[PDB]
Symmetry: C3
Subunit: 132 residues, 3 copies
C-alpha cells in the first residue's frame, strides 16, 4: 500500500488530567488518510510493518515531560524530558512494529505539557514500511 | 531510489542569524541528490519523502535553533539549550510530499553546531513512495 | 525485507568503557537479523539501511556517550548530560550502504543507560533498498 502521516502542534497542549491523548492541529502529510488530527490517532488500514517517530518539546516550566507511544491500550515505547532552569526540552523516540488492521497508534501525554508554534517543534509521524 | 546522509565534522559558528547548515561529509548519497557545499537536497522525482536531523550544539550559553526548510518556508523546528553550559541536541523529523525541483535544507537560526569525526550532527532523507 | 526494533527494560551500567549495548527484548525482528544477547545487527544482503536510536541516561553526573558502530568503526555518535543530575537522551540516526556480513551495533562509550518496562532506550533498523 501507501500509508504515511506527519502531524504537528501549532498551539500549546496543557491537559487538565494526566494520561490524555496528544491531539494535533496540523497535518504536514496524510497519505492514505489514516490519521485523525482531532483524536490524534493513527488507524492502521492493513496488516504490515510500520515505523513511528515523534519529537515533543515541553513547556519551559518545572514539570517533567513523560510521553508514551501507545498501541491501543499498551505502552510501546516512552520518552522523557526535563530541565530544571526551567528550559524547553525535547522528548523523542521511535518504534518499528508489526500491526494488524484496526490497531490504533497514538501519543499519550502521561505528565507535563507540550509547546506549539508555527515553527512546529512538536511532531508525530508514521508510515508503512512493508505490507503483510 | 533516493537517499542521503550527511554529517558535520568541524564546528559551525557563523556569527549571524539564519545561515544554511552546510555539511562536509557524506555518509550516503544514493541518487546524488544532495549538494554538500550547499547543504541542499534537490528533489529528483515527485513523491513522499522522509527527513531526520540531529544537531549537537556547542557547550556555550546560547540556545540552538534549527529549522528544516522547504524552499524558503520553515517546516519543522528544533530547539536545544543547557545553562551549565553543556552540549545539547536539537532534533526533529518530517514526512512530506515533494514536487520535483523542491529543495530541503537545514537553517541555523541561532546558535552554533559541534562537529567532529564522531559525527554528532547529522541530516538524512530518503524517498518513501514514488509519484 | 529486514527490520528490527530493540529496547532495554533494565539498567545498563557496565563498568568498563566502550562496551556493546545489549538489549533484552525485540519489538520486531523482520528477517531475523540482529541477536539480542550481543545487540548486533547482521547485514543479510547488500543494500541501503536506516538506523535510529534513543538512549536515556541514568540520573548521575556522568555524561552518556553512545556510538553507532559499523564493524569496528564509529559511524555517528550521540551525547547526553544534565548536571542536576537528571535523565537525558542521547539520540542519532544514519542511512548507509552495507555489504552482507557487515555488523551494526551500539557502543556505550561512557556513562550508563536507563531501562524500565516503559522502554525509553531503543535501537531500530530496516532495509531501505536492497542491492540486486
Ligand atoms: Ca536534551
Ligand atoms: Ca539540561
Amino acid at each position: 500500500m501507501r500509508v504515511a502521516f506527519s502531524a504537528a502542534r501549532t498551539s500549546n497542549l496543557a491537559p487538565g488530567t494526566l494520561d490524555q491523548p496528544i491531539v494535533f492541529d496540523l497535518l504536514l502529510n496524510n497519505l492514505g488518510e489514516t490519521f485523525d488530527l482531532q483524536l490524534g490517532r493513527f488507524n492502521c488500514p492493513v496488516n504490515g510493518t510500520y515505523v513511528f517517530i515523534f519529537h515533543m518539546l515541553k513547556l519551559a516550566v518545572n514539570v517533567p515531560l513523560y510521553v508514551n507511544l501507545m498501541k491501543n491500550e499498551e505502552v510501546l515505547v516512552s520518552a522523557y524530558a526535563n530541565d530544571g532552569a526551567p528550559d524547553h526540552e525535547t522528548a523523542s523516540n521511535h518504534a518499528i512494529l508489526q500491526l494488524f488492521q484496526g490497531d490504533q497508534i497514538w501519543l499519550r501525554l502521561h505528565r507535563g505539557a507540550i509547546y506549539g508554534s508555527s515553527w512546529k517543534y512538536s511532531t508525530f509521524s508514521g508510515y508503512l514500511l512493508y505490507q503483510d
